[PDB]
Design a protein around this nucleic acid. Sequence first.
DNA 1: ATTATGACGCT
DNA 2: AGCGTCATG
Length: 430
Amino acid sequence: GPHMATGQDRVVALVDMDCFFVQVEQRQNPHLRNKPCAVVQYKSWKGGGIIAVSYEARAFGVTRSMWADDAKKLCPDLLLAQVRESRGKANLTKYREASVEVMEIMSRFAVIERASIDEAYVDLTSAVQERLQKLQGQPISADLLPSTYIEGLPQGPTVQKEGMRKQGLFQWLDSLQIDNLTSPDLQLTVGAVIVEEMRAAIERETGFQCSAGISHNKVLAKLACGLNKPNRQTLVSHGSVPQLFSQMPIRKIRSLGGKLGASVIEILGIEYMGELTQFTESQLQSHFGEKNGSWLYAMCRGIEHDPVKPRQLPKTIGCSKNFPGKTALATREQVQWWLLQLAQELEERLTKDRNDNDRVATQLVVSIRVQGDKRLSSLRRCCALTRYDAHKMSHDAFTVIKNCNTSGIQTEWSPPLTMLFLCATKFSAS
DNA sequence: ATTATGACGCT
DNA sequence: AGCGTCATG
Ligand SMILES: [Mn+2]
Ligand SMILES: [Mn+2]
Ligand SMILES: [Mn+2]
């Protein structure tokens, strides 16, 4: 009806860098460009663990969370780049700095929400209004959308990928009412024009290619971004949602790839997101809780209200290291030495953060895992963070965790520690 | 031994 | 405050 709100108020984009860590290494080392390549952490155990994979390597079945030795079985010519190691641990500074490069360019076009090291949501609503009032009813040319897919098109009454892309785009642009400055489809289209410009600026000024999704909210923008990777962007209109969701596994929607999504599937006896529409809001709230139920009721209709938060910088700065198998920490000197290594990296990153961003952290969170505990964190404890001093930070973390040592001998540490994590939180403008 | 993080919800 | 969940470069 004329009041059933349709969640079409906003234009939201999700920009995701393609195989980011790989692109950072390929920019630095041209020998790795346009090759099957992957980025690995460490080397000794099974060749190191892969954390990023070029699309050429993905064609061979290489994935993240794969040991490099196994990846080399699938792709013997796979090229590898190793993450920096400093103070005995992986150091991701190069990739954080590259991320800042990209986030600063995105911020020129609109306010962004840093969702991860390599992805940000963009609220384009205002930028779209301004570009519309600049165009003054002039139609949008396909030339303004050279890497855009329109999800769901072409449809109705060439065998090449780009030919299909252009056919769908032409169907979309023909149907456009470029006279209605309040038409949601037109607003999304102008949003996509802007995202083409943003992605062009990112590639020109960093060398990095990215994909993007443009829709009316964050969940649809994220889903859209994944439909045509790499180096492409996808527009998911409100109208495309019924068909898109009719065959979309529930786990593909952000927030539903874990336990909650499995419970939606099992409790309701469904497989696809579109099947959620048959339940009342009260029914969904009865199985999944007030918040999740309302969210699911709206999401399966393409509607979600989560705002793009104005936040370009991480809320937390943390340092973590696992000590698996034999490498678990069994002496107090071991535990203190590694706490100091982590605290030294933390101090360096925190000092750079305070210089760059005019803020200081005030809470230190210390997390540990003990051997035999299946939970990723066995214990989390906070203390005050009043000085950027690695020695103080590490002594405080030790003070806060030392009561976990069940060993009657203070020299020994039982049960051995399989993970240490230091996290600076609660920033204040400084 | 699937590693180093980061965000957020729950109570 | 501490724990759990979800994401995944
Ligand atoms: Mn990415
Ligand atoms: Mn990403
Ligand atoms: Mn990924």
